[model samples]
Target: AMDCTTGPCCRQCKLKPAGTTCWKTSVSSHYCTGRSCECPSYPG
Candidate 1:
């Protein structure tokens, strides 16, 4: 697993070698970079 808090791959998800979906992180500018993490979701 991995993490993404930047552009493009921020809203989507990824696995070892396949594709997946982003998890619901029940934040602001939640910068991250591990398996199953938060996204930089806007609050506006």
Candidate 2:
């Protein structure tokens, strides 16, 4: 149960794969800032 600032933040998560290790994990929470913030995601 995560959330993002806007649709773009959520979209970014959708764009990435699970457990990327670089940017925020897909399916996780999102932030409007850079890749500093982390998000929730499904198990890999």
Candidate 3:
């Protein structure tokens, strides 16, 4: 449940190796902004 645009919240929502660090980094604007916001694989 996340909008791929504006950030990679979509990616955050679909972390494969799901965990605390992954969740934090994926959802975090720090990484999301830098990364290409796309919901290709990340689907939560």
Candidate 4:
């Protein structure tokens, strides 16, 4: 039972398939963000 729809961690979907990635598997908490046009935002 959790419904703080307007609170600290809403306005976002929990993420399904078809998200990105960091090649060689590198930084970022959002481990899946799409690709090369289909890849993730490889963090520094």
Candidate 5:
């Protein structure tokens, strides 16, 4: 599962590829360096 607490490429995060899509809370501001993890607009 994707850890929403950290960035897209965090050690615990499963989504690290550049085009991977993940869900992130509106308050989450973690910078994704591995790639531009474009979060969805769905409610967190």
Candidate 6:
């Protein structure tokens, strides 16, 4: 699972590849460089 503390929608996230959908993708501005291994606040 992915943690989206900033918001519940990932469709507005620019880090995701083009043509991606929120239903299939999740992104975070805190780690936009793809350098994170664990989400800070996922439900687990």
Across residues 13-40, which tens digit of lDDT does each residue of candidate 6 receive?
Answer: 3244322322323443322223222223
TM-score, one value per model: 0.18, 0.18, 0.15, 0.16, 0.25, 0.20
Tens digit per residue, CA lDDT, model 3, 1-44: 54534333344434333222223434442222233443233424
lDDT of 4 by residue, 1-44 (tens): 34432311222423334443224433433333322122334443
TM-score of 3: 0.15
- Candidate 4 local distance difference test against the native: 0.32
Cα error, candidate 4, residue 1 (Å): 48
What would the per-residue lDDT of candidate 1 be over residues 1-44, giving only the tens digit for each residue?
A: 44543433344544221233233345332333334334334332
CA deviation > 4 Å runs, candidate 1: 1-10, 15-28, 40-44
lDDT of 5 at 44: 21
Which lDDT tens digits does candidate 2 get at residues 1-44? 45443343345444334334333555653333344224433233
Question: Candidate 6: worst 10 consecutive residues by lDDT?
Answer: 30-39
Q: What's the count of clashing pairs in each model shown?
A: 1, 3, 0, 9, 0, 0
The Cα error of candidate 5 at residue 16, in Å, is: 0.7
Best by TM-score: 5
lDDT of 5: 0.44
Model 5, 1-44: lDDT tens digits are 65344544444545465433344456653333344344434332
Lowest summed lDDT across 10 adjacent residues in model 3 is found at 15-24
Off by over 4 Å in 5: 1-5, 13-15, 24-33, 36-44
Report the Cα RMSD per candidate.
9.6, 10.3, 10.8, 9.7, 8.8, 11.8
Which scores higher on TM-score, 2 or 5?
5
- In candidate 6 the C-alpha lDDT for residue 9 amounts to 32
Candidate 4: count the clashes.
9
**Which residue pairs collide, candidate 4?**
19-34, 20-33, 20-34, 21-40, 34-38, 34-39, 35-38, 35-39, 36-39
Ordering by lDDT: 5, 2, 1, 3, 4, 6
Q: What do the candidate models score in CA lDDT, each in turn?
A: 0.37, 0.39, 0.35, 0.32, 0.44, 0.32
